[PDB]
Protein backbone atom coordinates (compact mmCIF):
# COMPACT_ATOMS: atom_id res chain seq x y z
CA UNK A 1 0.00 0.00 0.00
CA UNK A 2 0.96 3.66 -0.27
CA UNK A 3 0.13 6.96 -1.90
CA UNK A 4 1.63 10.22 -3.10
CA UNK A 5 0.23 13.37 -1.44
CA UNK A 6 0.95 16.41 -3.63
CA UNK A 7 -1.10 19.59 -3.22
CA UNK A 8 -4.75 18.61 -2.76
CA UNK A 9 -4.22 15.32 -4.67
CA UNK A 10 -3.83 11.70 -3.54
CA UNK A 11 -2.16 9.40 -6.13
CA UNK A 12 -2.78 5.68 -5.60
CA UNK A 13 -2.60 2.48 -7.54
CA UNK A 14 -5.95 2.25 -9.41
CA UNK A 15 -6.34 -1.35 -8.19
CA UNK A 16 -6.06 -0.15 -4.53
CA UNK A 17 -8.32 2.90 -4.83
CA UNK A 18 -11.08 3.03 -2.16
CA UNK A 19 -14.75 3.96 -2.57
CA UNK A 20 -13.86 7.41 -1.11
CA UNK A 21 -11.19 7.76 -3.81
CA UNK A 22 -13.73 6.96 -6.58
CA UNK A 23 -16.28 9.31 -4.92
CA UNK A 24 -13.66 12.14 -4.98
CA UNK A 25 -12.14 11.19 -8.36
CA UNK A 26 -9.90 13.63 -10.31
CA UNK A 27 -8.43 11.30 -12.93
CA UNK A 28 -7.83 7.57 -13.48
CA UNK A 29 -6.18 5.40 -16.18
CA UNK A 30 -6.41 1.53 -15.98
CA UNK A 31 -3.61 1.12 -18.55
CA UNK A 32 -1.26 2.98 -16.11
CA UNK A 33 -2.69 1.47 -12.85
CA UNK A 34 -3.16 5.05 -11.55
CA UNK A 35 -5.98 6.96 -9.87
CA UNK A 36 -5.93 10.49 -8.40
CA UNK A 37 -8.53 11.70 -5.87
CA UNK A 38 -9.00 15.11 -4.13
CA UNK A 39 -7.85 15.73 -0.49
CA UNK A 40 -8.95 18.29 2.18
CA UNK A 41 -5.40 18.72 3.68
CA UNK A 42 -2.34 19.67 1.53
CA UNK A 43 0.35 16.97 1.06
CA UNK A 44 4.08 16.78 1.87
CA UNK A 45 5.34 15.30 -1.45
CA UNK A 46 7.01 17.03 -4.42
CA UNK A 47 6.79 15.42 -7.90
CA UNK A 48 10.06 15.00 -9.82
CA UNK A 49 10.17 16.76 -13.23
CA UNK A 50 13.10 15.09 -14.95
CA UNK A 51 14.30 12.01 -16.91
CA UNK A 52 16.38 10.47 -14.06
CA UNK A 53 16.96 6.72 -14.36
CA UNK A 54 18.46 6.31 -10.84
CA UNK A 55 16.66 6.62 -7.53
CA UNK A 56 15.53 4.83 -4.38
CA UNK A 57 12.28 2.89 -3.79
CA UNK A 58 10.54 1.60 -0.66
CA UNK A 59 9.90 -2.14 -0.47
CA UNK A 60 7.34 -2.88 2.28
CA UNK A 61 7.94 -6.68 2.02
CA UNK A 62 11.58 -6.01 3.13
CA UNK A 63 10.98 -2.93 5.32
CA UNK A 64 13.83 -1.43 3.24
CA UNK A 65 14.58 1.32 0.75
CA UNK A 66 16.76 0.13 -2.17
CA UNK A 67 18.79 2.22 -4.61
CA UNK A 68 17.91 1.24 -8.21
CA UNK A 69 18.51 2.01 -11.87
CA UNK A 70 15.23 1.95 -13.81
CA UNK A 71 14.10 2.10 -17.42
CA UNK A 72 12.33 5.14 -18.92
CA UNK A 73 8.52 4.90 -18.88
CA UNK A 74 7.27 2.59 -21.64
CA UNK A 75 4.48 0.23 -22.78
CA UNK A 76 5.38 -3.13 -21.23
CA UNK A 77 3.84 -6.57 -21.10
CA UNK A 78 3.20 -7.57 -17.49
CA UNK A 79 2.57 -11.21 -16.48
CA UNK A 80 -0.55 -12.03 -14.39
CA UNK A 81 -0.44 -10.91 -10.69
CA UNK A 82 -2.94 -11.41 -7.83
CA UNK A 83 -4.61 -8.08 -8.88
CA UNK A 84 -4.34 -7.98 -12.71
CA UNK A 85 -4.37 -10.47 -15.58
CA UNK A 86 -1.39 -10.62 -17.96
CA UNK A 87 -1.69 -7.32 -19.90
CA UNK A 88 0.14 -4.33 -21.40
CA UNK A 89 0.69 -1.51 -18.90
CA UNK A 90 1.74 2.01 -20.14
CA UNK A 91 4.05 4.57 -18.47
CA UNK A 92 5.81 1.70 -16.64
CA UNK A 93 9.48 1.75 -15.52
CA UNK A 94 11.32 -1.46 -14.57
CA UNK A 95 14.19 -2.12 -12.19
CA UNK A 96 15.93 -5.18 -10.79
CA UNK A 97 14.56 -5.65 -7.29
CA UNK A 98 11.98 -7.29 -5.06
CA UNK A 99 8.27 -6.53 -5.45
CA UNK A 100 5.26 -8.50 -4.15
CA UNK A 101 1.63 -7.35 -4.59
CA UNK A 102 1.45 -5.61 -1.18
CA UNK A 103 4.51 -3.53 -2.17
CA UNK A 104 2.31 -1.53 -4.56
CA UNK A 105 2.22 2.15 -3.56
CA UNK A 106 5.84 2.31 -2.34
CA UNK A 107 7.50 5.52 -3.56
CA UNK A 108 10.37 5.66 -6.05
CA UNK A 109 12.24 8.99 -5.60
CA UNK A 110 15.18 10.71 -7.28
CA UNK A 111 17.04 13.92 -6.47
CA UNK A 112 14.08 15.89 -7.92
CA UNK A 113 11.30 14.29 -5.82
CA UNK A 114 8.76 11.51 -6.32
CA UNK A 115 9.11 9.64 -9.67
CA UNK A 116 6.28 7.10 -9.22
CA UNK A 117 4.89 4.25 -7.17
CA UNK A 118 5.43 0.45 -7.20
CA UNK A 119 2.82 -1.11 -9.55
CA UNK A 120 4.26 -4.51 -10.75
CA UNK A 121 6.57 -7.27 -9.51
CA UNK A 122 7.65 -10.86 -10.03
CA UNK A 123 10.63 -12.53 -11.75
CA UNK A 124 13.14 -10.40 -9.86
CA UNK A 125 11.86 -7.05 -11.24
CA UNK A 126 9.92 -4.16 -9.71
CA UNK A 127 7.78 -1.96 -11.94
CA UNK A 128 6.85 1.64 -11.14
CA UNK A 129 4.00 3.68 -12.52
CA UNK A 130 5.52 6.99 -13.55
CA UNK A 131 3.90 10.26 -12.49
CA UNK A 132 6.51 12.75 -13.76
CA UNK A 133 4.46 13.45 -16.95
CA UNK A 134 1.41 14.51 -14.86
CA UNK A 135 2.29 18.19 -14.73
CA UNK A 136 -1.22 19.21 -13.55
CA UNK A 137 -0.44 17.54 -10.17
CA UNK A 138 1.71 20.68 -9.40
CA UNK A 139 -1.24 23.20 -9.54
CA UNK A 140 -4.99 23.85 -8.98
C1 LIG B 1 6.70 5.86 -24.05
N2 LIG B 1 5.59 4.97 -23.72
C3 LIG B 1 5.00 4.21 -24.83
S4 LIG B 1 4.62 5.39 -22.50
O5 LIG B 1 3.69 4.34 -22.36
O6 LIG B 1 5.44 5.76 -21.41
C7 LIG B 1 3.81 6.84 -23.06
C8 LIG B 1 4.44 8.06 -22.95
C9 LIG B 1 3.77 9.19 -23.41
C10 LIG B 1 2.52 9.04 -23.94
N11 LIG B 1 1.91 7.86 -24.05
C12 LIG B 1 2.56 6.78 -23.62
ZN1 LIG C 1 15.06 13.22 -11.14
Kindly state the DSSP code that residue 58 receives in the 8-state scheme. Answer: E
> 32 C-alpha to center of ligand 1: Å?
10
Report which secondary-structure segment, H or E, holds 19. helix 19-23
Q: Resolution in Å, one decimal, please.
A: 1.3
> 130 C-alpha to center of ligand 1: Å?
10
Integer Cα distance of 9 and 57 in angstroms: 21
- Residue 51 buriedness (CB in 10 A; 0-12 / 13-18 / 19+): exposed
> Which residues, 6+ apart, have CB-to-CB distance to 73 below 8 Å?
90, 91, 92, 93, 130, 132, 133
Question: By the 8 A CB rule, do 103 and 118 touch?
Answer: yes
Residue nearest to atom 1 of ligand 1 (CA): 74
What ligand has the least distance to the C-alpha of 111? 2
CB atoms within 10 A of CB 44: 8
What ligand has the least distance to the C-alpha of 51? 2
Integer Cα distance of 55 and 51 in angstroms: 11
Partners of 55 in the β-ladder: 68
Amino acid sequence: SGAIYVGNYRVVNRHLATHNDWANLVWEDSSRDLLVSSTTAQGCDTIARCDCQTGVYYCSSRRKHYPVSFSKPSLIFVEASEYYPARYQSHLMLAVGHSEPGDCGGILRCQHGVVGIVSTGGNGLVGFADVRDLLWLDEE
